[PDB]
Coordinates of C-alpha atoms and ligand atoms in Angstrom, one line a residue:
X18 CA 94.3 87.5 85.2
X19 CA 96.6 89.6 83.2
X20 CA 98.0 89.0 79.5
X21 CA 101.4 86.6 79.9
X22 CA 103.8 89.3 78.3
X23 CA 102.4 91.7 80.9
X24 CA 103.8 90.0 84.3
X25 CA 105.6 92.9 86.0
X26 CA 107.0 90.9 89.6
X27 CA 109.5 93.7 89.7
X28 CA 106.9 95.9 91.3
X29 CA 107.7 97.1 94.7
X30 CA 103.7 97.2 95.8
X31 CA 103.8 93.3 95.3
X32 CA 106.3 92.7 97.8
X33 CA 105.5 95.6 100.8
X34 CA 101.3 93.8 100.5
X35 CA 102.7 90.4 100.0
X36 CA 101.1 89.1 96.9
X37 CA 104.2 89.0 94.3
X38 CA 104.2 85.2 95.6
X39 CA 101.2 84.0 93.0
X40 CA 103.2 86.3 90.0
X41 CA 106.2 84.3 90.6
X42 CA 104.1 80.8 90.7
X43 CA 102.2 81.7 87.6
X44 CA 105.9 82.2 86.1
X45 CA 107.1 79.1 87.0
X46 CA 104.2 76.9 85.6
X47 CA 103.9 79.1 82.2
X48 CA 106.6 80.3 81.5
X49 CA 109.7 80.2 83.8
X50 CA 112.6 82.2 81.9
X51 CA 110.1 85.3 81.3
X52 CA 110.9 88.7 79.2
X53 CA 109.6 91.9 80.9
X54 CA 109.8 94.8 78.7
X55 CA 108.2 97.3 80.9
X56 CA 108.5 97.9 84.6
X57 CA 109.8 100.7 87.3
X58 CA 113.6 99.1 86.1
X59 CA 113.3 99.0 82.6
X60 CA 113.2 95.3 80.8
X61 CA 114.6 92.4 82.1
X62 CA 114.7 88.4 82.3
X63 CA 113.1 86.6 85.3
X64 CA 114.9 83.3 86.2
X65 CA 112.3 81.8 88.4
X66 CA 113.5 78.2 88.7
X67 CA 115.6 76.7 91.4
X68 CA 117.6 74.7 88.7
X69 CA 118.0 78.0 86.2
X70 CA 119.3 80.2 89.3
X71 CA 121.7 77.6 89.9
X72 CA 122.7 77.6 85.9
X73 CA 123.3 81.6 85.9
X74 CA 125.1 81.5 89.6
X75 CA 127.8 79.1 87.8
X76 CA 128.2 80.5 84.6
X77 CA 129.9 83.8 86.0
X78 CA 131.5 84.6 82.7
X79 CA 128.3 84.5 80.7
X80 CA 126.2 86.4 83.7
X81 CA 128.8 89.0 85.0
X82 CA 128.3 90.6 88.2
X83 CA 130.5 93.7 87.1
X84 CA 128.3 97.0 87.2
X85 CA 125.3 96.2 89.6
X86 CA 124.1 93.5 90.8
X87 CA 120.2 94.6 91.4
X88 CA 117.4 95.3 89.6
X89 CA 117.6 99.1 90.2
X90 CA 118.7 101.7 88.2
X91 CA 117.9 105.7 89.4
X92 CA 119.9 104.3 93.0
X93 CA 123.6 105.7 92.7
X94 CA 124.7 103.7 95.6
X95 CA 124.2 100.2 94.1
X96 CA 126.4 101.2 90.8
X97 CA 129.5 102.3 93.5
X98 CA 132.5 99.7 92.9
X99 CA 131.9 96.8 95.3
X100 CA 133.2 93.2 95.2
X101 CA 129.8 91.6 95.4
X102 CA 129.2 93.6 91.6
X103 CA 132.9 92.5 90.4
X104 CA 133.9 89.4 88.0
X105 CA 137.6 87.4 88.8
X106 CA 139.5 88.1 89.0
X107 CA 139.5 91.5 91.4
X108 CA 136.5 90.1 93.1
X109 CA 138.7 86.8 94.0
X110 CA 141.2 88.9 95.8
X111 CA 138.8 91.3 97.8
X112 CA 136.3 88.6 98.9
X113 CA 139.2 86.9 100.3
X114 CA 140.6 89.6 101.9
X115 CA 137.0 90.3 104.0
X116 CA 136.5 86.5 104.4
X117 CA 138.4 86.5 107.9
X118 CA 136.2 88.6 109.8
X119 CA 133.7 85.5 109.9
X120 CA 136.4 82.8 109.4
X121 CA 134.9 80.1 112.1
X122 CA 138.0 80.3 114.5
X123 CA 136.9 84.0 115.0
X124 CA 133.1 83.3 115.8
X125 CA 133.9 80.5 118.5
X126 CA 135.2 83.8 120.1
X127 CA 131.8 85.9 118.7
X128 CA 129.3 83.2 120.2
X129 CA 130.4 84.4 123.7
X130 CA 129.6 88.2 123.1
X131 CA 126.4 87.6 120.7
X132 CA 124.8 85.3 123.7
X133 CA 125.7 87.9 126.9
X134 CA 124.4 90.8 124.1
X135 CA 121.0 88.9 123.4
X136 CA 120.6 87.6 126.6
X137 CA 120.6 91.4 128.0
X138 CA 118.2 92.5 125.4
X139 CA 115.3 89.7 126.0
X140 CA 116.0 90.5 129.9
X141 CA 114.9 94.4 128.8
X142 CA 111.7 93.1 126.6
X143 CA 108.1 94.4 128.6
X144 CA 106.0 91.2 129.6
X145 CA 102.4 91.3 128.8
X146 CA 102.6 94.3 126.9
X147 CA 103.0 95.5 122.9
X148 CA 106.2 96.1 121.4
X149 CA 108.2 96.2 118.3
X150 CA 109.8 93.3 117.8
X151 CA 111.9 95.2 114.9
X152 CA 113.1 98.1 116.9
X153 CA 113.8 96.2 120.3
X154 CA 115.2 92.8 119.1
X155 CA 116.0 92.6 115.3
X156 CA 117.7 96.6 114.9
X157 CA 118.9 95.7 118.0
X158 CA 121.3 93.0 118.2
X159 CA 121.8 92.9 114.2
X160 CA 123.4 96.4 114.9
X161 CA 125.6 95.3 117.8
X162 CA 126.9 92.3 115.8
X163 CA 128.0 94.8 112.8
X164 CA 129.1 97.8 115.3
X165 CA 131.7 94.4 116.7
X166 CA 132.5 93.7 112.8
X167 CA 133.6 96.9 112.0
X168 CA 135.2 97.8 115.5
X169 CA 132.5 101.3 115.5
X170 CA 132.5 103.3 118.1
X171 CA 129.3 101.5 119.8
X172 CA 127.6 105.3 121.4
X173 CA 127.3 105.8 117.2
X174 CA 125.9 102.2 116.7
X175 CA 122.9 103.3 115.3
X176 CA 124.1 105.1 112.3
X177 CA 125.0 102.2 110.7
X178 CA 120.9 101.1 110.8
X179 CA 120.6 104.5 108.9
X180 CA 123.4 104.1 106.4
X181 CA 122.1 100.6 105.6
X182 CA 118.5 101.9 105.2
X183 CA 119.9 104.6 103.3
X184 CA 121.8 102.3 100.6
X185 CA 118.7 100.4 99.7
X186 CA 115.9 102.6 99.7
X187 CA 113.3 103.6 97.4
X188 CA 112.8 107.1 96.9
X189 CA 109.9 108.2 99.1
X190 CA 109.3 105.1 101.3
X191 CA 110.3 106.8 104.6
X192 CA 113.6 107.1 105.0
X193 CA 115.2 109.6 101.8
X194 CA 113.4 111.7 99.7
X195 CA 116.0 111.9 96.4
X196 CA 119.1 110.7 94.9
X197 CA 120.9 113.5 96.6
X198 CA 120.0 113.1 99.5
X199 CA 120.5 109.4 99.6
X200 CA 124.6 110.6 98.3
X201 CA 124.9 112.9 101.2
X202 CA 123.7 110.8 103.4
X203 CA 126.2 108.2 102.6
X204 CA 129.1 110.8 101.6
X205 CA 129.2 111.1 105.8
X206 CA 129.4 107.0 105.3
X207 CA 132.6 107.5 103.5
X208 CA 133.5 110.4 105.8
X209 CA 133.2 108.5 109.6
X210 CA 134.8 105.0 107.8
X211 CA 137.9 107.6 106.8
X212 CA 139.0 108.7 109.7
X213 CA 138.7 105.2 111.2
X214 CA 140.5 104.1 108.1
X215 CA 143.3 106.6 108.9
X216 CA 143.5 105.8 112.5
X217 CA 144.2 101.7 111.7
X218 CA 146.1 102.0 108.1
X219 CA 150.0 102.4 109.0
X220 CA 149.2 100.4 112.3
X221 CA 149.6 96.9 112.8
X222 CA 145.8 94.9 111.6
X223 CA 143.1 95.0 114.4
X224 CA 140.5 92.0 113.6
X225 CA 137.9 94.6 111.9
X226 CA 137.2 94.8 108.6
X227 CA 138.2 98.2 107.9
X228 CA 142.1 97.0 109.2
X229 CA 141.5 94.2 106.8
X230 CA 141.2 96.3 103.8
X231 CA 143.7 99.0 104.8
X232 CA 146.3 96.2 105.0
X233 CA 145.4 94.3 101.7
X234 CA 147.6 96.1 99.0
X235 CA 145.2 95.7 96.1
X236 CA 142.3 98.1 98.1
X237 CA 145.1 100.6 99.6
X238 CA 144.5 103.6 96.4
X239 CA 140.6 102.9 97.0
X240 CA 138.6 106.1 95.7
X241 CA 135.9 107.2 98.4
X242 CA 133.4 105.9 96.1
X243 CA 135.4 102.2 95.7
X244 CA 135.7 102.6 99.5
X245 CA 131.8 103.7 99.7
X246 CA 130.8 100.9 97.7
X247 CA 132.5 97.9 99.5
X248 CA 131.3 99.7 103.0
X249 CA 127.8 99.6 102.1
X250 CA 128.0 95.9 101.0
X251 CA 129.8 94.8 104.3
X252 CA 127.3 97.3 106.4
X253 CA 123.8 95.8 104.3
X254 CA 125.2 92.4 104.1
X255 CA 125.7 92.4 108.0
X256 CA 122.6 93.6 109.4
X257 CA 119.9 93.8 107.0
X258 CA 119.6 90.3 106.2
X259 CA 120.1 88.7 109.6
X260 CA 117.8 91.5 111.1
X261 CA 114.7 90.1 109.0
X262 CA 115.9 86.8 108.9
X263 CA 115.5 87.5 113.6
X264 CA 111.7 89.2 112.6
X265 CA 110.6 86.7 110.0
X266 CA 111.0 83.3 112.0
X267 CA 108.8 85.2 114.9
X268 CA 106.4 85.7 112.3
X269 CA 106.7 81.8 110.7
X270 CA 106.3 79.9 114.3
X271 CA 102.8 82.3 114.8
X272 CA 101.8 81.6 111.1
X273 CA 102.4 77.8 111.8
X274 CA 101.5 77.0 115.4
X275 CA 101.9 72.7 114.8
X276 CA 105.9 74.0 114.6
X277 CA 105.8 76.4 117.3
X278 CA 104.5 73.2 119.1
X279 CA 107.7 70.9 117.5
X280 CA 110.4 73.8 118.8
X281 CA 109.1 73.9 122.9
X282 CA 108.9 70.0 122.7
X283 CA 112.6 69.7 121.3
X284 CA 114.6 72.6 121.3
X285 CA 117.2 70.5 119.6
X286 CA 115.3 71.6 116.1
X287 CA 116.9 75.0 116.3
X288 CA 119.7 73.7 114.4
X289 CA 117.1 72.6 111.1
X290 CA 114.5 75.7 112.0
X291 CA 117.3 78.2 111.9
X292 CA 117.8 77.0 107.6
X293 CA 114.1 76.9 107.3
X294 CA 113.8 80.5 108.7
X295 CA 116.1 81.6 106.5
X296 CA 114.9 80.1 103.0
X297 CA 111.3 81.2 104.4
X298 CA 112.1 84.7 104.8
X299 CA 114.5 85.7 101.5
X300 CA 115.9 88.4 102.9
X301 CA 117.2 89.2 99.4
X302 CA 114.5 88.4 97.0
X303 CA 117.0 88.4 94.2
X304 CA 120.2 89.1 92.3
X305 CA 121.1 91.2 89.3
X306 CA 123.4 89.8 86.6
X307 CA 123.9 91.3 83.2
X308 CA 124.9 89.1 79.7
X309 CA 128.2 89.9 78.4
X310 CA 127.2 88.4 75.3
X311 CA 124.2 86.4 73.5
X312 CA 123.3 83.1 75.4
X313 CA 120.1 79.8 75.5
X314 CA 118.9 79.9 79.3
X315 CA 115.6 77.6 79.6
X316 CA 115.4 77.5 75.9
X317 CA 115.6 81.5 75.3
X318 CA 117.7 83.7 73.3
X319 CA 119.3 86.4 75.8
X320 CA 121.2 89.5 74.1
X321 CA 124.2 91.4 74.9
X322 CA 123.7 93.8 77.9
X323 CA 120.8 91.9 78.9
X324 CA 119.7 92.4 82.5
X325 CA 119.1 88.7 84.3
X326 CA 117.5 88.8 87.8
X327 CA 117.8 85.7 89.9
X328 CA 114.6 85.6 92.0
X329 CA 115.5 83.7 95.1
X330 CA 112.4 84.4 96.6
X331 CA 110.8 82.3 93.6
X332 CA 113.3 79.7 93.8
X333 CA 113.0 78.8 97.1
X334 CA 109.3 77.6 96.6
X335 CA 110.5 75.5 93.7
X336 CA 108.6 72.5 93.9
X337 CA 111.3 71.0 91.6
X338 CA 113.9 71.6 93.9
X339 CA 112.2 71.5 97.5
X340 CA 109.4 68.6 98.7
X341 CA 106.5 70.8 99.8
X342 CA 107.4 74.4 99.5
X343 CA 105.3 76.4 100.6
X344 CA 105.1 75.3 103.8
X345 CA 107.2 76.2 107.1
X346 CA 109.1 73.1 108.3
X347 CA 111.5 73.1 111.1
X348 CA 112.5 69.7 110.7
X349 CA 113.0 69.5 106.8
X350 CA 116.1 66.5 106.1
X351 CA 118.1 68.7 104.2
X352 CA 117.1 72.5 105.7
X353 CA 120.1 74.1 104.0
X354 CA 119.3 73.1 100.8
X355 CA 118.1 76.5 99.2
X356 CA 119.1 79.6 97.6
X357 CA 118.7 82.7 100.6
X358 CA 122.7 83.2 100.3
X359 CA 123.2 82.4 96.4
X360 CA 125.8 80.2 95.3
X361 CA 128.9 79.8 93.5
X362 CA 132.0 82.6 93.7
X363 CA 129.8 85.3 95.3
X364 CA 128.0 83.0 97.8
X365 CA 127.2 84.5 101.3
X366 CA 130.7 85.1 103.3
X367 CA 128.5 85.8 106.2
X368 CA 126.2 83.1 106.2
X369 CA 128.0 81.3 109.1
X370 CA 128.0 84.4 111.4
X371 CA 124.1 84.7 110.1
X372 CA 123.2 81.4 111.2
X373 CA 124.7 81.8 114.9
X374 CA 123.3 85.0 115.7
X375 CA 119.8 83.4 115.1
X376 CA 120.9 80.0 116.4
X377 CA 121.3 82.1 120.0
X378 CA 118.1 84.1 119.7
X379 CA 116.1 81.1 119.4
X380 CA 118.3 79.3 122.3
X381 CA 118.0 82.4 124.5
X382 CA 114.3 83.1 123.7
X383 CA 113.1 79.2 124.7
X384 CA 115.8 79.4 127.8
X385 CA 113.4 82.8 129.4
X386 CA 110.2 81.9 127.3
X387 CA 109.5 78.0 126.6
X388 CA 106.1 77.0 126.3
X389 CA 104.2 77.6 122.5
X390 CA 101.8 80.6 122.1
X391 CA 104.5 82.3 124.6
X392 CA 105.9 85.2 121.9
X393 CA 103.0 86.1 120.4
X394 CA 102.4 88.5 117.2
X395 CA 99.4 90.6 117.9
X396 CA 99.0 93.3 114.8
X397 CA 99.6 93.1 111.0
X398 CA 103.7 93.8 110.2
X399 CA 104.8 96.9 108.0
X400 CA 106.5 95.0 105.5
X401 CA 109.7 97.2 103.0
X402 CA 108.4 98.5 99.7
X403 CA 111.2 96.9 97.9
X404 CA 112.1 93.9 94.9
X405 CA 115.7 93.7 96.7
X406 CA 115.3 94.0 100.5
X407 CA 111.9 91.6 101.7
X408 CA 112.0 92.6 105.7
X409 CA 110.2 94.4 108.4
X410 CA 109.9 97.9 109.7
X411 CA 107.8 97.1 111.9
X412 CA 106.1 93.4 114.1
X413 CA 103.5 94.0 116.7
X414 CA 105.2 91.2 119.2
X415 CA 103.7 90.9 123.0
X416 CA 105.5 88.0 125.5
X417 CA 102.8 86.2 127.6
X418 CA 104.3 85.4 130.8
Ligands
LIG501 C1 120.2 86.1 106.4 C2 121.4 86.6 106.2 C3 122.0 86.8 104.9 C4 121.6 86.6 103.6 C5 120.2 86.1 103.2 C6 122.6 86.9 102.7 C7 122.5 86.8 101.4 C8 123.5 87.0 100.5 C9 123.4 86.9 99.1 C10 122.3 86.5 98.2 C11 124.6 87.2 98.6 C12 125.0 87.2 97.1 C13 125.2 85.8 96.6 C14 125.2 85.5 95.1 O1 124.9 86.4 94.2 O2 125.4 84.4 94.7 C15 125.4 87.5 99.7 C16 126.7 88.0 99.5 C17 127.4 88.5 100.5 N1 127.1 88.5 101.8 FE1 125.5 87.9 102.6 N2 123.7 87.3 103.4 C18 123.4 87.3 104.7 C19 124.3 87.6 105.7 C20 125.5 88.2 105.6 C21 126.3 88.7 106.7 C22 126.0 88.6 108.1 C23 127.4 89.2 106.1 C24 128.4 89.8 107.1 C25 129.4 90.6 106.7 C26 127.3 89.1 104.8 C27 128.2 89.5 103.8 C28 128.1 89.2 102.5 C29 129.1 89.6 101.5 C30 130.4 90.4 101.8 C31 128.7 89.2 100.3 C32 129.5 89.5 99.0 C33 130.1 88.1 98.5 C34 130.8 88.1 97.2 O3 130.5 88.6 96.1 O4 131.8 87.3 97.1 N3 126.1 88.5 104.5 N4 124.7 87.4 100.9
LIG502 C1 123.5 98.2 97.6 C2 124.0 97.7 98.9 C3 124.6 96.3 98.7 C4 123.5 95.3 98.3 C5 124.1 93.9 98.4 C6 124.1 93.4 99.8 C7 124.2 91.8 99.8 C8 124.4 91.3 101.2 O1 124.1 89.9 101.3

């Protein structure tokens, strides 16, 4: 309906009411590489295409990560130095150096913990009765998982839910009301990590993450707001995603009862459903680069200080890259062929540790609960006003039993 040059995807109301989807289509038939000169972020390209993601994901010294790496920018706490929004070769030696915590010889030990902690938390779900599926499941456990990550004192757990919230709010939504707020909210961020940083630097390396970076000499000077930056990539990174990546499948197998049907007849599918969930959901809808200098992407002429935004969200219904798209399969030949964790030098480190906590819902959930229909979604969820975070505050979620 509206003019071509007119396309705004970038507009948080499209995301929280769930329509942005037929934007990004439209974008993809017409014109896939598209200029937006006006929008709540300023102008910007849209790389819509599975294949053109894939192009600006490998050409790191073309479409640097340095200063931010979203689409925002009023939000302080996504222009904080972090790794994620660094070029090689700094970003080399700090990915590394956090890379351990989810190293696979550490989550053989993990898989014990996450299945006793989700175990207890389905075992505490009411039966036959309403509840948020968010707050009693997804918060939940996502929480616990990062609390372990980070060795936090586990009474204060849920502070981390806040800071996370915090980092990637809009102004207004709920949760902060300015950019001063959201600083002061996080300056006692920096404030709690510090004195944990201060009780493990000069000590011999626990297996936590902030041991790891107290012990790797290129992060030792760290500023608070270096030290603020990396904390809320680690803390958004390792409960955000995974938390709406645990609400979203819930919301895929009620959506699409023939696969509900599939998993309770072979709960073997976990291991291709688990992919699927994750490609369906996005978690991140996108990420930010900027053009150090003037480049061709899908025949257009990109300037110097250009902002590029990788929609994920757009390239994972790429019928040029995936059979079928737009539908939910939990049985796809190649599940984890899609874009949810990027690719290239800044793909996912997490993504492993992502893929067993909701391996071990799903197990635990069909162990207590296995016949279809049996986790039901009975009310509309309150999806995030957001182009960066697509999740869940809220899923109406009763268990018929
Ligand atoms: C469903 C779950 C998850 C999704 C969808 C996800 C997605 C992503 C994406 C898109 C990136 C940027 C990739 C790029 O630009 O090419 C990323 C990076 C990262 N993720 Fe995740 N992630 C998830 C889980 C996790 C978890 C559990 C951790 C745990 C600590 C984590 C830590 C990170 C870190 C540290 C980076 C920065 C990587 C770098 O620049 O080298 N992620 N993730
Ligand atoms: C602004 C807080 C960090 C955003 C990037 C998180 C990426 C986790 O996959």
């Amino acid at each position: 309906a509206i003019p071509l040059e007119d396309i705004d995807v970038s507009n948080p109301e499209l995301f929280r009411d769930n329509t942005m989807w037929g934007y990004f289509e439209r974008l993809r038939r017409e014109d896939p590489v598209h200029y937006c000169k006006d929008s709540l972020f300023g102008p910007y390209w849209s790389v819509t295409k599975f294949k053109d993601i894939m192009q600006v994901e490998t050409h790191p010294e073309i479409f640097s990560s340095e200063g931010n790496i979203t689409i925002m920018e009023s939000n302080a706490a996504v222009t904080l130095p972090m790794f994620i929004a660094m070029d090689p070769p700094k970003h080399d030696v700090q990915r590394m150096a956090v890379s351990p915590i989810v190293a696979p010889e550490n989550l053989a030990k993990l898989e014990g913990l996450i299945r006793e902690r989700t175990g207890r938390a389905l075992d505490g779900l009411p039966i036959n009765e309403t509840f948020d599926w968010v707050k009693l499941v997804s918060i939940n456990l996502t929480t616990q998982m990062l609390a372990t990550l980070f060795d936090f004192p586990w009474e204060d757990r849920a502070k981390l839910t806040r800071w996370s919230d915090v980092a990637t709010a809009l102004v207004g939504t709920g949760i902060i009301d300015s950019e001063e707020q959201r600083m002061e909210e996080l300056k006692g961020c920096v404030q709690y990590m510090t004195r944990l940083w201060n009780e493990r630097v000069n000590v011999p390396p626990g297996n936590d993450l902030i041991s790891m970076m107290a012990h790797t000499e290129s992060m030792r000077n760290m500023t608070p707001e270096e030290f603020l930056g990396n904390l809320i990539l680690l803390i958004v990174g390792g409960n955000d995603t995974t938390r709406n990546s645990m609400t979203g499948g819930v919301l895929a197998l009620n959506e699409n009862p023939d696969e509900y049907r599939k998993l309770c007849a072979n709960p073997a599918l976990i291991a291709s459903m688990v992919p699927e969930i994750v490609r369906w959901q996005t978690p991140l809808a996108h990420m930010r680069r900027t053009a150090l200098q003037d480049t061709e992407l899908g025949g257009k002429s990109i300037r110097k200080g250009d902002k590029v935004i990788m929609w994920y969200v757009s390239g994972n219904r790429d019928p040029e890259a995936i059979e079928n798209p737009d539908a939910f399969i939990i049985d796809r030949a190649k599940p984890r062929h899609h874009l949810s964790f990027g690719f290239g030098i800044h793909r996912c480190v997490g993504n492993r540790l992502a893929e067993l906590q909701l391996r071990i819902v799903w197990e635990e959930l069909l162990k207590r609960w296995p016949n279809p229909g049996q986790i039901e979604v009975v009310g509309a969820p309150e999806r995030v006003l957001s182009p960066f975070v697509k999740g869940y505050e809220s899923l109406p979620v009763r268990i018929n039993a």
